[PDB]
Structure 1
Amino acid sequence: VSMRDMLKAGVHFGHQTRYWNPKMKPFIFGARNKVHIINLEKTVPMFNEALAELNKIASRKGKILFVGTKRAASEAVKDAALSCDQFFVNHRWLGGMLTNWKTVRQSIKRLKDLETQSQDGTFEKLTKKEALMRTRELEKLENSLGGIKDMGGLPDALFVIDADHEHIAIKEANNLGIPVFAIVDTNSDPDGVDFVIPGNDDAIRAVTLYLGAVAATVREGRSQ
């Protein structure tokens, strides 16, 4: 990753001056047109060492999950995870899915049974009414937790989009002592994240840049 490629995607952009969190005053260079400018000369070493640690953990054989739930950012997250042989969540984060795994992991078995009944020819016999409920059940259990169906246990790292919009997952992971790599704007709380990567996180270009970089480094680490 290079500084010019970062500035080309709008990473320099931040948020307004009246919405800034003073916990990351150090990661701000200046302000123009009543908008903060992120000191990206801090961003480059952070991003590089974060990628190094991510691919090291990939070589350490630790499954990972990609967390992004924005309405205009789901496809990038799901594709970056899918073409990485890893896991993803792109809808509402079902609260407690980590700390309360014992009661959500059977929703996985329910989804699997429903999908076998779907693509096995079972949805023909019954009296043409409950198939509607079954189809909606497939739809909802696919949208909610259909991206971790083959998770098979707790993860070993988490990648987070919009630390503000995704703080419940951050607390859930912090409970379990699992490292978190998150993207933070200038209105974010960097307390729960041990590997902090500053940068704009409302533009599609920067988000897909980060996702491509992390997918590439994870494939590198698996190539070991």
Structure 2
Amino acid sequence: VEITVKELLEAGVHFGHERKRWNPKFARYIYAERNGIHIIDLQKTMEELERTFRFIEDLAMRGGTILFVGTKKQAQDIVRMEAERGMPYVNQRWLGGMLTNFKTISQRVHRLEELEALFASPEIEERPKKEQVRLKHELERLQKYLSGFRLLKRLPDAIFVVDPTKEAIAVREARKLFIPVIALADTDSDPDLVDYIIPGNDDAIRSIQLILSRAVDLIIQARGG
């Protein structure tokens, strides 16, 4: 399982953004501009996807956990399902602090582990029917935001983010903690902040869908089966 220059075209991976939004630093990853939009050099994308996948692989081979990040409405369900098949992910909201204030965030994990505990329990039917609903609500939100974070029992060995310029909170945090950043990066982004880059469309389903799967494909390849 590697990836064809062809398959990448079909994904529409090389379709960049308009020329308006644009990070000149990113120029080193561009073929040319057709009708307003920069077209990402796939001959490059491919040779970076290699250096990058080679990292992902050995990291996985050594047991590392990779935190997947996508807030964008396009990604969400792709990040989710892809992660699961076996890492943690963030796909609802990036709660500022999740990495650098990891402790007091994971505190919120034990809260829902403990509210999960309380709803399987008899002791719930005790509380007045008002706290009862107001406690189911507390639990509910926690599951929303944390259903993927709750797998992290310590900081990731690397984070893999979809769209670094959307996420550069998440990114900032990683770099401050010396965790390697991997990203699917479009032309709007500072590639200098990305330790392990994949330049290509950070926008279309058909694009992310391809990348994330082949990543994950590679992961459980090099986890023994």
The TM-score by the shorter chain falls in which range?
Answer: over 0.9
Q: Which amino acid aligns with 1:95?
A: G
1:20 is displaced (CA, Å) by 1.4
Identity %: 44
Contact 2:74/2:203 (<8 A) preserved: no
Partner of 2:91: 90
Residues 109-148 of structure 1 deviation map (CA, whole Å, 9 limit, x = unaligned): 1010001112334432322111221111112111122212
Partner of 1:5: 7
Equivalent-residue separation in structure 1 for 2:219 and 2:179 (angstroms): 18
Superposition TM-score, scaled by structure 1 size: 0.95
Find 1:41's aligned residue among 36, 43, 59.
Answer: 43
Partner of 1:61: 63
Equivalent-residue separation in structure 2 for 1:18 and 1:95 (angstroms): 29
Contact 2:22/2:188 (<8 A) preserved: yes
Q: Which amino acid aligns with 1:67?
A: V
Find 1:29's aligned residue among 15, 28, 31.
Answer: 31
Partner of 2:72: 70
Equivalent-residue separation in structure 2 for 1:178 and 1:222 (angstroms): 21
Superposition TM-score, scaled by structure 2 size: 0.95
**For structure 1, which segment, 206-215 or 124-133, has the greater mean C-alpha deviation from structure 2 after superposition?**
124-133
- Pairing of 1:99-110 with structure 2 (within 5 A): 99-110=100-111
1:205 aligns with 2:206: yes
Partner of 2:16: 14
Equivalent-residue separation in structure 2 for 1:219 and 1:121 (angstroms): 40
Q: Which amino acid aligns with 2:46?
A: V
Partner of 1:191: 192
Equivalent-residue separation in structure 2 for 1:118 and 1:210 (angstroms): 39
Equivalent-residue separation in structure 2 for 1:92 and 1:168 (angstroms): 11
1:221 is displaced (CA, Å) by 1.4
1:52 is displaced (CA, Å) by 1.5
Residues 22-69 of structure 1 deviation map (CA, whole Å, 9 limit, x = unaligned): 001111111111111111100111112211210111111111111011
Equivalent-residue separation in structure 2 for 1:72 and 1:173 (angstroms): 23
Equivalent-residue separation in structure 2 for 1:222 and 1:147 (angstroms): 20
1:162 aligns with 2:192: no
Question: Is the alpha carbon distance of 1:23 and 1:109 closer, same or farther for their aligned partners in structure 2, counting shifts above 3 Å?
Answer: same
Counterpart of 2:31 in 1: which secondary structure? strand
Counterpart of 2:150 in 1: which secondary structure? coil
Equivalent-residue separation in structure 1 for 2:37 and 2:216 (angstroms): 31
Equivalent-residue separation in structure 2 for 1:45 and 1:119 (angstroms): 51
**For structure 1, which segment, 203-212 or 92-101, has the greater mean C-alpha deviation from structure 2 after superposition?**
92-101
**Unaligned regions of 5+ residues in structure 1, if any?**
none
Higher helix share: 2
Partner of 1:138: 139
